[PDB]
Amino acid sequence: VWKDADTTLFCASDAKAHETEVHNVWATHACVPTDPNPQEIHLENVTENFNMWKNNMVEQMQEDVISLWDQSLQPCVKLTGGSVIKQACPKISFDPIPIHYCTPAGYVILKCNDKNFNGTGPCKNVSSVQCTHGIKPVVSTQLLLNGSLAEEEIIIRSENLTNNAKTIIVHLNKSVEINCTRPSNGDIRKAYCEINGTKWNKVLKQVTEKLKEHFNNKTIIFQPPSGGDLEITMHSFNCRGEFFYCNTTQLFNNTCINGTITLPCKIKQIINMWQGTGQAMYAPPIDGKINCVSNITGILLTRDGGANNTSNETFRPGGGNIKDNWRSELYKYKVVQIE
Numbered sequence: 106v107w108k109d110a111d112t113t114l115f116c117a118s119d120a121k122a123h124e125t126e127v128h129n130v131w132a133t134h135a136c137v138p139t140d141p142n143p144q145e146i147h148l149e150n151v152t153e154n155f156n157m158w159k160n161n162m163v164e165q166m167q168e169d170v171i172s173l174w175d176q177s178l179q180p181c182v183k184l185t186g187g188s189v190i191k192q193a194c195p196k197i198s199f200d201p202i203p204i205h206y207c208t209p210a211g212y213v214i215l216k217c218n219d220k221n222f223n224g225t226g227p228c229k230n231v232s233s234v235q236c237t238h239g240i241k242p243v244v245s246t247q248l249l250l251n252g253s254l255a256e257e258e259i260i261i262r263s264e265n266l267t268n269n270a271k272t273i274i275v276h277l278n279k280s281v282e283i284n285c286t287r288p289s290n291g292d293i294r295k296a297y298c299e300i301n302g303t304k305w306n307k308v309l310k311q312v313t314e315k316l317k318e319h320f321n322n323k324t325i326i327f328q329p330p331s332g333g334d335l336e337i338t339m340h341s342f343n344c345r346g347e348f349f350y351c352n353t354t355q356l357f358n359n360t361c362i363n364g365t366i367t368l369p370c371k372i373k374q375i376i377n378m379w380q381g382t383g384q385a386m387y388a389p390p391i392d393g394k395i396n397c398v399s400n401i402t403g404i405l406l407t408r409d410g411g412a413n414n415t416s417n418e419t420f421r422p423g424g425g426n427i428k429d430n431w432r433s434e435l436y437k438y439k440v441v442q443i444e
């Protein structure tokens with residue numbers, strides 16, 4: 106017998122003790138080795154309710170990533186609550202590794218295995234595990250990178266689709282690569298991201314059709330963000346320790362619904378911290394070619410309000426709440442107390 110419960114989780118990883126990469130260093134001191142032969146019990150005739158939007162596992166992972174960034178990514182200058190902190194800001198080795206979240210004795214993790222599970226409601230095909238799958242703490246906005254893919258159809262996730270103030274998580278079932286490079290050999294902060302237009306437009310059209318199913322067959326329109334901070338209006342992410350801000354106007358341009366799409370990007374030293382603190386300034390980019398090839402596995406969308414009396418619904422790429430990023434991977438898990 107069991108019941109829904111919150112408890113202090115621990116983590117597991119395959120981090121290397123000799124590696125200087127900061128995720129490896131953090132996990133070496135904060136996690137245990139993974140289980141090579143993890144047990145999983147599939148529960149027969151069991152119906153369990155899940156709520157990805159109210160899941161303490163998300164808050165706990167958030168706390169890990171914050172602590173990781175606090176120890177690994179201290180800026181030269183920090184601006185918090187009127188205070189000004191000036192510390193050393195050396196260049197680091199940065200590349201996220203998978204992190205497993207696990208329950209202690211007396212508790213287990215219930216895993217929903219329903220193929221098109223949207224994150225809320227009952228789940229039929231439920232299994233029991235001690236640890237989640239390996240989740241890379243990839244911090245980004247607009248586009249979810251290097252995540253897990255949906256098994257069957259593209260999944261739309263929201264705490265309340267009718268509420269346009271609630272973020273929409275689109276879970277892709279097909280990866281689309283994004284190739285971002287700050288070239289080595291005039292503007293050291295100038296960069297770009299290349300994406301195959303054929304793949305992207307094909308996928309975005311599939312997302313369009315899926316959104317129609319959730320919005321009574323209304324016409325789905327994509328538009329670039331209207332306003333706000335650069336972290337939201339642009340696709341922001343971290344590559345090799347460097348913060349990249351990319352213009353995704355070409356990606357959300359309804360007309361193409363075939364060549365290579367080259368997004369204009371820039372490496373920013375001054376950033377609005379995703380931790381919710383204030384602003385921070387980092388050192389200028391390292392020398393040489395800075396390159397990251399990522400899979401786009403999900404999209405964060407915000408729907409416009411005031412469209413009830415029209416046949417259109419307008420969606421714009423958004424984000425900013427990094428907890429939504431962890432939700433996109435933790436949606437199928439919940440902790441129960443074994444009694």
Ligand SMILES: Cc1nc([C@@H](NC(=O)C(=O)Nc2ccc(Cl)cc2)[C@@H]2CCCCN2)sc1CCO
Binds near residue numbers: 245343348378379
């Ligand atoms: C105070 C606070 N501000 C937050 C803001 N979010 C961010 O600054 C942010 O994501 N920055 C960000 C994102 C990605 C990368 Cl690689 C680096 C920085 C929000 C986003 C939505 C609109 C307003 N800005 S998140 C947060 C607290 C969250 O608990």
Ligand SMILES: *[C@@H]1O[C@H](CO)[C@@H](O)[C@H](O)[C@H]1NC(C)=O
Binds near residue numbers: 221
């Ligand atoms: C659950 O499992 C059944 C039988 O294996 C399978 O046919 C079905 O796709 C699953 N149902 C759901 C709700 O995902």
Ligand SMILES: *[C@@H]1O[C@H](CO)[C@@H](O)[C@H](O)[C@H]1NC(C)=O
Binds near residue numbers: 226262
């Ligand atoms: C998800 O599925 C549940 C039923 O399991 C349903 O009540 C809810 O409306 C769905 N949410 C979305 C985002 O479609």
Ligand SMILES: *[C@@H]1O[C@H](CO)[C@@H](O)[C@H](O)[C@H]1NC(C)=O
Binds near residue numbers: 251252399
């Ligand atoms: C990128 O996606 C591909 C194809 O879906 C997958 O094989 C690979 O593991 C992914 N790479 C990551 C997660 O870095």
Ligand SMILES: *[C@@H]1O[C@H](CO)[C@@H](O)[C@H](O)[C@H]1NC(C)=O
Binds near residue numbers: 256259260279311315
């Ligand atoms: C992805 O999901 C869509 C439905 O959302 C489906 O039509 C398509 O076949 C899926 N693609 C793959 C490769 O499974």
Ligand SMILES: *[C@@H]1O[C@H](CO)[C@@H](O)[C@H](O)[C@H]1NC(C)=O
Binds near residue numbers: 265267268
């Ligand atoms: C979803 O949001 C809409 C608009 O804010 C609201 O009218 C509705 O009551 C919400 N649904 C729930 C279950 O709270």
Ligand SMILES: *[C@@H]1O[C@H](CO)[C@@H](O)[C@H](O)[C@H]1NC(C)=O
Binds near residue numbers: 284285286299398
């Ligand atoms: C990424 O783009 C760069 C610059 O065009 C190119 O040299 C490189 O081959 C690309 N990488 C991959 C794996 O496609």
Ligand SMILES: *[C@@H]1O[C@H](CO)[C@@H](O)[C@H](O)[C@H]1NC(C)=O
Binds near residue numbers: 317318322
């Ligand atoms: C349009 O979407 C509705 C659901 O909103 C669906 O019932 C209908 O089958 C779709 N269009 C067609 C093929 O009539």
Ligand SMILES: *[C@@H]1O[C@H](CO)[C@@H](O)[C@H](O)[C@H]1NC(C)=O
Binds near residue numbers: 338339352353354
């Ligand atoms: C993105 O690029 C377009 C021009 O292609 C420009 O008009 C727009 O202002 C850019 N977006 C941002 C947020 O810089």
Ligand SMILES: *[C@@H]1O[C@H](CO)[C@@H](O)[C@H](O)[C@H]1NC(C)=O
Binds near residue numbers: 354355359360361
């Ligand atoms: C969006 O599509 C239109 C097609 O009319 C094109 O002219 C425009 O350049 C596109 N936006 C881009 C690629 O920045």
Ligand SMILES: *[C@@H]1O[C@H](CO)[C@@H](O)[C@H](O)[C@H]1NC(C)=O
Binds near residue numbers: 300363
């Ligand atoms: C995208 O991939 C398709 C294969 O589906 C290929 O034909 C095309 O060369 C690629 N487009 C670009 C310009 O990257």
Ligand SMILES: *[C@@H]1O[C@H](CO)[C@@H](O)[C@H](O)[C@H]1NC(C)=O
Binds near residue numbers: 342396
């Ligand atoms: C995604 O995964 C690839 C392969 O490990 C990595 O090279 C790339 O830097 C990752 N992207 C991000 C944004 O971390």
